[PDB]
Amino acid sequence: MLIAFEGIDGSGKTTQAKKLYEYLKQKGYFVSLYREPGGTKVGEVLREILLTEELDERTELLLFEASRSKLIEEKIIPDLKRDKVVILDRFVLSTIAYQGYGKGLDVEFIKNLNEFATRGVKPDITLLLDIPVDIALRRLKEKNRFENKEFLEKVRKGFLELAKEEENVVVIDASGEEEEVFKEILRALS
Amino acid sequence: MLIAFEGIDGSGKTTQAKKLYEYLKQKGYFVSLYREPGGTKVGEVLREILLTEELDERTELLLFEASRSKLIEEKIIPDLKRDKVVILDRFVLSTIAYQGYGKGLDVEFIKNLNEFATRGVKPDITLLLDIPVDIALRRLKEKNRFENKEFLEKVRKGFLELAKEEENVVVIDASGEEEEVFKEILRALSGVL
């Protein structure tokens, strides 16, 4: 059981991944929650680098995929083998949307890179928490965080295109209140 | 002018890259010397990680390539544009040999990853400092450094296969004394430069 949450900052995907983690834990599943980039000692070092430094888009992609590769080999593949439920805050779709549709890198290439980092490991289901960029930015505004609307509009379109073309992707209206969004996710996970 | 030095540890490639750097500087070229992984603030952080941590071979490749990518965009492409001579201690061939022939990853994939990191930037000439593994290990022994002969034998074969199939590669007999190895390198370089 691999469950992947995907979408832009301000979509609530972090809060809802955490909500799903606590809820399935209470129902008696053995659960993991990891974020990308991050989730291992090494991926957290890369994460800090990805937030700290000024990086061109190729270097940044390679580091995202190095984090992913560590996480896959160190934790996910063994978690899966022990039948843990694995919940991910961001996965392969967010890399395509951000580094491909966002920043212009080749989508097929990103897909192949993703296949290499994951050893072909694919989610049972991917939850795309879709939200208009205007709303996402208003929510970030509240935590004094600012991001690029032009860039995020492209990223949004990317995500929606991927939802209609890639396999096992449910589009969740992430514009709702916390509890309505979560109910819609449970609906999708049944 | 991009000059790539390639080969196993103990081949003297680091010492000879440095030697070529001083000699061309003295002849009045503007020269850069970079190592892989490393050569930029970020690449050096990755380098430390690649030496420090226990890493599976996919993660390691992706970091080597991320260091490369930073170097190519931060320094090499602008150096080349200002007509600097760029000398590299290791480059794309060492990744194929080590991660492909060494550790079993797919060679065409490495190549494509290489092409991505380099933006298609290719050396004018690649110097392969070829040396028997027994000799390379005896030279490391002297600095208290030890490496895996089984693994390096595969890497060495890899390199030699690449030399006969890839473009603009000269095999240098790296088993010689320092000065003879250098004179053989100058001979190979009189090609271009």
Question: Do A44 and A182 touch, CB atoms closer than 8 A?
Answer: no
Domain range annotation of chain B: 1-193
CATH architecture of the domain with range B1-193: 3-Layer(aba) Sandwich (3.40)
- Which strands make up the sheet holding B85-89, listed edge to edge? B31-35, B85-89, B2-6, B125-130, B169-173
The reply to whether A63 touches chain B by the CB within 8 Å rule is: yes
Method: X-ray
Q: How many whole angstroms separate alpha carbon A178 and alpha carbon B32? A: 56
The answer to whether the bond into A37 is cis (omega within 30° of 0) is yes
DSSP-assigned beta bridge partners for residue A177: none
Q: How many whole angstroms separate alpha carbon B33 and alpha carbon A3? A: 46
Q: How many whole angstroms separate alpha carbon A109 and alpha carbon A104? A: 11
Query: Cβ contacts of residue A116 below 8 Å, gap of 6+?
Result: A65, A69, B58, B109
The reply to whether B48 touches chain A by the CB within 8 Å rule is: no
Alpha-carbon distances of B118 from A58, B111, B128, rounded to whole Å: 10, 10, 19
CA-nearest residue to A113 within chain B is B113
Question: Do B143 and B113 touch, CB atoms closer than 8 A?
Answer: no
Q: Which two tokens stand for residue A98?
A: 């951000």
Q: How many CB atoms lie within 10 A of CB A41?
A: 10
Q: How many whole angstroms separate alpha carbon A77 and alpha carbon A74? A: 7
What's domain A1-190's superfamily in CATH?
P-loop containing nucleotide triphosphate hydrolases (3.40.50.300)
The HSE-up count of residue B88 (CA atoms within 13 Å, CB side) is: 32
Question: Do B139 and B106 touch, CB atoms closer than 8 A?
Answer: no
Residue with the two structure tokens 């469950």? A3
Query: Cβ contacts of residue B69 below 8 Å, gap of 6+?
Result: A56, A58, A59, A62, B116, B117, B118
Among B56, B69, B112, select the one facing A58 at the smallest CB separation: B69
Which resolution, in Å, applies to this structure?
Answer: 2.3
Dihedral of CA B65/B66/B68/B69: which sign?
positive
Which chain A positions have a beta carbon within 8 Å of B63's beta carbon? 62-63, 66
Question: Do A56 and B70 touch, CB atoms closer than 8 A?
Answer: yes
Q: How many whole angstroms separate alpha carbon B125 and alpha carbon A116? A: 30
Q: How many CB atoms lie within 10 A of CB B112?
A: 14
Mutate to test the interface with B, among A62, A68, A112 (most CBs of B within 10 A): A62
**Among the listed residues B110, B49, B74, the one whose alpha carbon sits nearest the alpha carbon of residue A58:** B74
Which chain B positions have a beta carbon within 8 Å of A109's beta carbon? 112, 116
